[PDB]
Amino acid sequence: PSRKAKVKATLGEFDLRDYRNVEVLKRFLSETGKILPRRRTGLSAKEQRILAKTIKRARILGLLPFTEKLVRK
Template sequence: MSRDYDDRDSIFEVEEEIERGGRGGGGGGRGGPGGRRMHRRKICRFCIEKVDLIDFKDVKLLQSYIPERGKILPRRISGACATHQRMLSEAIKRARNIALLPYATD
């Protein structure tokens, strides 16, 4: 189950790594002491882009928040803030109802 998320996670990870590189921050963020992952603050994409409304018709956007299995990408991975995650999940559920997005895929 966590497998679908893992590769998604890695995609986000890579993006962040690039950002860090651009900013010239310290390298080697991965793997803190004892093999535990370092905490890195993820920033809500929607807050940065100042999105006030997430439309259920915007399939392209929503699609990037459902991994292969069709589940909604959790906040701990997407990094979305509570408000935007709520909007997002609402929109995804509406889109599912009208068959724009799948309820489940395998």
């Protein structure tokens, strides 16, 4: 379905290769640290890809989560 917003527009001008811009990247993960499906991040095939490697790169530095507990429910 995906009937809400779109992490693409719900943001501004930024660098996908930025593995230290926590506040922005944070935006690309669900309630759970799982990286976002492209058909949600609104990115392209080539962006969604850089982003990915960026995120995963940052997780290692300890700035982003590898996994979170699903609240609500």
